[PDB]
Structures are given as structure tokens and as C-alpha cells.
């Protein structure tokens, strides 16, 4: 639903480490891969940047 549907979620975090991925503006770019892997790797213990 999140990917191709109309669901948008705001995750309350407070503070969090972040990481940057720069890209060339003049070329297609779809961040689903990264945001997927982020969600995939969340844990009752962990939470990647």
C-alpha cells in the first residue's frame, strides 16, 4: 500500500541517525529499494540509519 497505494505513515522517533545518498537529478531515481531495506531491517532492538 505504501509503495504504489495511497498510505503515508509518520513514524514518531524523536531523534535518529541519518545517512545520505546523493544522486544525479537528470536521471531516473527510485528510492524504494533503500526505504524498503530500512523497513525490512527494523527490530525490537535495532533500527538502521
Amino acid at each position: 500500500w505504501i509503495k504504489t497505494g495511497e498510505l503515508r505513515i509518520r513514524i514518531e522517533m524523536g531523534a535518529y541517525p541519518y545517512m545520505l545518498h546523493y544522486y544525479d537529478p537528470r536521471q531516473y531515481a527510485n528510492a524504494w529499494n533503500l526505504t524498503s531495506a530500512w523497513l525490512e531491517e527494523i527490530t525490537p532492538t535495532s533500527i538502521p540509519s
Binding site: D24, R26, Q27, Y28
Partner: protein, 36 residues
């Protein structure tokens, strides 16, 4: 020949001493460098 005439013509007057992807045009490329 003209040159030959000119020569002969002057030779009678002589005297001597006496004794990837591009959204602009849609062309497809293969190198990031080939794009720039």
C-alpha cells in the same frame, strides 16, 4: 604553350656584353561520461 610563347618573345630582345538515458532528446547512452 603560353609560357613558351612568352619565353621565345623575350628571347629576341636580349643583349650581351661585348668582346543511461537522456530526457532531452530521448537518445539512449551507455556511459555517465558519454552523457555529460
Amino acid at each position: 604553350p603560353m609560357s613558351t610563347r612568352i619565353a621565345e618573345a623575350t628571347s629576341a630582345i636580349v643583349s650581351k656584353h661585348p668582346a543511461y538515458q537522456c530526457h532531452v532528446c530521448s537518445a539512449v547512452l551507455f556511459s555517465p561520461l558519454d552523457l555529460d
